[PDB]
Design a protein around this ligand. Structure first.
Ligand SMILES: Nc1nc2[nH]cnc2c(=O)[nH]1
Ligand SMILES: Nc1nc2[nH]cnc2c(=O)[nH]1
Ligand SMILES: [Zn+2]
Ligand SMILES: [Zn+2]
Lengths: 463, 463
């Protein structure tokens, strides 16, 4: 039908920066002046301008000037029904769910409210740079239906599903394991793998899931092997204690999900925070992934996710970063990277022996430094592999879907542009590009997101 | 000469919220529709609209509509010469100073560069909501002179001084204790208490101050009792170790400064982070103050400032929050409050016994929750008392200087206004006001700063 070509400064990844200590540039791919040829929303050719322009004689080239074009940000952990309540005051995980979250999520039972939230949810995500997300919904199929459908109109790849909740929640909010299986089964029928929609069996979290509800998820996963599994794991100490109480026959939090064959490829456990090295090794082995949500971890007091452990090359764990809106107070992955770096630097101090020498470990302390290479790989290619959708997204490789963002390195607080000028203007090398991207992360915010494209179509453009 | 009256929704403090557990509203003062009469930049009358409008028949009332007017934010710890380098990658305190800070601060030797930095420094502060700040400069008198003078043109109250550095820094950057005393003496002459300028004897930090340099500060403080003392204390573990090495004859970091009579009223020690309860008690007793810089503490990996300990009612320590630009990555006190709350919530989890019951302490765990009352009192009245300038600033009490900010509760990321609407529109009670201010802190950023006034004069107005 149509074929357009995007021109400008491009920056993406072809490998994991963690795999290149002291030489991360090798994981990045930079084109000061490149051209991407997208046909019907699919990359067909990527490379330097001349060479590509020449191989494609008459294509309509759209020139995004003075920006750094990167792949659309992947957010592996948001709560759709929490879009309106992301700054609840005073509570840790548990009392907060009861006090501020459930009373709001219950409103999504009403289809009109659900439709409006879904609209605002997706608008906030686009204005933030996020083109793909794995979303939690409420226990009512309504919110899930409205989300998949509005996602279709914008034709965005999205992972979502009915979020079952069995115990420890209001009676009017929880719903029977039977109905959950029934509804999830219906929703998988109507939405899974239709267009860019992907379904995820979603037992909210062990603490709120009776063994019947989890047994239901097990059945669902068995009758629908292609479906994803999305949940929470080891986020709060009180939560961890309760879980082993609600599930007396299990050794660790991850053990609860393994008892039902939920752990393996396409499994995402939000908030590592309190996972043991054993639990990390097990996930690495089975291919399960963890979602690092720093903004939330800090806002709710959960703690410091051990980034250096999950990235251990001997037992590498698959990951995707997350905003965790509700728990987290920011919709942008750029804001997530800000807190992600902070958590990692605090970890660096805990592992260098400056305090307790017996806990020292420089290799891990080094892995906690979130460079612009590591941070941006994590919200794109890395997040794609962590969600097992790297065949469709992650970078500008031909054959992948064309979701992308035009970053304005000068956006953000007043201090940004004089800071960025330390590098005149436009980035001329992969190092200068990486250097400005770190400034986007730490000195700027969503004001750096100038344009958000989905399938070769520009859905957003900062006023 | 002139007399103007500001009208609109006002919110300020008359007491410490910490002093009112379970009833913080009592520390706040709310006027849904009030009028402030300022004559030549000095509050002359404050109170509800009618009553004030009536007592002042023909005053030019300027109506700031749809905003929440609060006192100008006090920032007790910024580094002027670091304005351009606030997002340096990969290092903890020490290696970072060597790698990214000194090479930039040395440029301020040149008066043209210094003049431009001072300009950008103050612009960033105003666009951020900060009207008063205690600033660190470089070792060259130039940067200090240019700062005081540009502060005069805008007529802003500012605490600053020659930042002496003796050891552990480049040779071209450090300067003799003699010259330091000489120059500081000159600068105190020309600037201290002239207009709204206040001088602070500034030994950068024990680690970089030979006993001669500190003995010089002692002399200065003795010949100029009215001058402030500004420095750093216990920010990094490696830094703490080095200090006790560079000062073998002292027991604790605070002990180094007491050896020279620097600790007492008007003393500010940046970054509590590694202070002992004994050190806190000593400061509380002598009246010295600590400056909590959460953004910096997290960015450099320093750690979690024990907010609950400094606010201990039996040994209350005077405070002022700080951005610490350079170390910190944000110029706004609103952004500082975001990380301040996060540090405090992580502390709440460490003190509630959910992990180690022997370390439990609910009274302190409670004091770590940064409510909109506690947070905003800290960046205004609280910060004023912590800097001993509460006679001139802090709130809208008649006789105080009229520095203020018009906050737009709807500013910030896309999600803000649907979130704030959970309260139709305009705040009708002190609770609704506090409720929206917490959303300013956590869901918004500097985009919430619509107007910044200094001495009854509007210096800034968001485009
Ligand atoms: N992100 C998040 N997920 C949850 N699942 C159950 N409780 C929580 C929570 O507090 N935060
Ligand atoms: N804020 C801050 N002050 C200092 N004084 C000496 N070193 C430091 C540092 O790393 N950060
Ligand atoms: Zn979650
Ligand atoms: Zn400092």
């Amino acid at each position: 039908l149509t074929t357009v070509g995007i021109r400008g400064t491009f920056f993406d990844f072809v490998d994991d920066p963690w795999k290149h200590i002291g030489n991360e540039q090798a994981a990045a791919r930079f084109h000061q002046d490149g051209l991407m040829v997208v046909t019907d929303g699919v990359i067909k050719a990527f490379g330097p301008y001349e060479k590509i322009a020449a191989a494609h004689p008459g294509v309509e080239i759209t020139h995004i000037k003075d920006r750094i074009i990167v792949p659309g940000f992947i957010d592996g952990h948001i709560h759709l029904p929490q879009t309106r309540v992301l700054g609840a005051y005073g509570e840790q995980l548990l009392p907060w769910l009861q006090k501020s979250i459930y009373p709001e999520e219950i409103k999504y039972k009403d289809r009109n409210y659900a439709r409006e939230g879904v609209k605002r949810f997706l608008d906030a995500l686009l204005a933030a740079g996020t083109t793909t997300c794995q979303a939690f919904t409420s226990s009512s199929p309504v919110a899930t239906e409205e989300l998949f459908e509005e996602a279709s109109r914008r034709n965005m790849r999205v992972i979502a599903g009915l979020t079952g909740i069995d115990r420890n929640a209001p009676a009017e909010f929880i719903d029977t394991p039977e109905n959950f299986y029934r509804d999830s089964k219906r929703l998988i029928a109507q939405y899974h793998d239709k267009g860019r929609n992907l379904y995820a069996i979603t037992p909210r979290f062990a603490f709120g899931a009776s063994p019947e509800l989890l047994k239901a998820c097990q059945r669902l996963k068995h009758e629908h092997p292609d479906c994803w599994v999305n949940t929470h794991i080891s986020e709060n100490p009180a939560e961890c204690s309760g879980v082993l109480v609600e599930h007396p026959d299990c050794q660790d939090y991850l053990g609860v999900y393994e008892k039902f064959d939920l752990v393996g490829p396409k499994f995402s456990g939000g908030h590592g925070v309190y996972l043991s090295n054993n639990e990390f090794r097990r996930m690495s082995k089975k291919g399960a992934a963890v979602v690092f949500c720093p903004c939330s971890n800090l806002f709710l007091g959960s703690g410091l996710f051990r980034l250096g452990r999950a990235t251990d090359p001997e037992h590498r764990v698959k990951m995707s970063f997350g905003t965790d809106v509700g728990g987290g107070n920011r919709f942008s992955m750029i804001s997530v990277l800000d807190d992600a770096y902070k958590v990692g630097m605090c970890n660096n101090t805990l592992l260098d022996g400056s305090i307790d020498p017996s806990r020292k470990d420089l290799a891990e302390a080094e892995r906690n430094k979130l460079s612009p290479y590591r941070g941006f790989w994590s919200v794109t290619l890395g997040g794609a592999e962590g969600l097992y959708i790297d065949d469709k997204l992650g970078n500008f490789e031909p054959g992948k879907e064309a979701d992308f963002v035009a970053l304005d390195p000068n956006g953000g607080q007043l201090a940004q542009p004089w800071h960025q000028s330390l590098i005149g203007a436009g980035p001329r090398t992969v190092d200068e590009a990486a250097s400005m991207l770190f400034a986007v992360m730490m000195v700027g915010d969503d004001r750096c997101v100038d344009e958000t494209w989905v399938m070769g179509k520009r859905l957003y453009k900062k006023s």
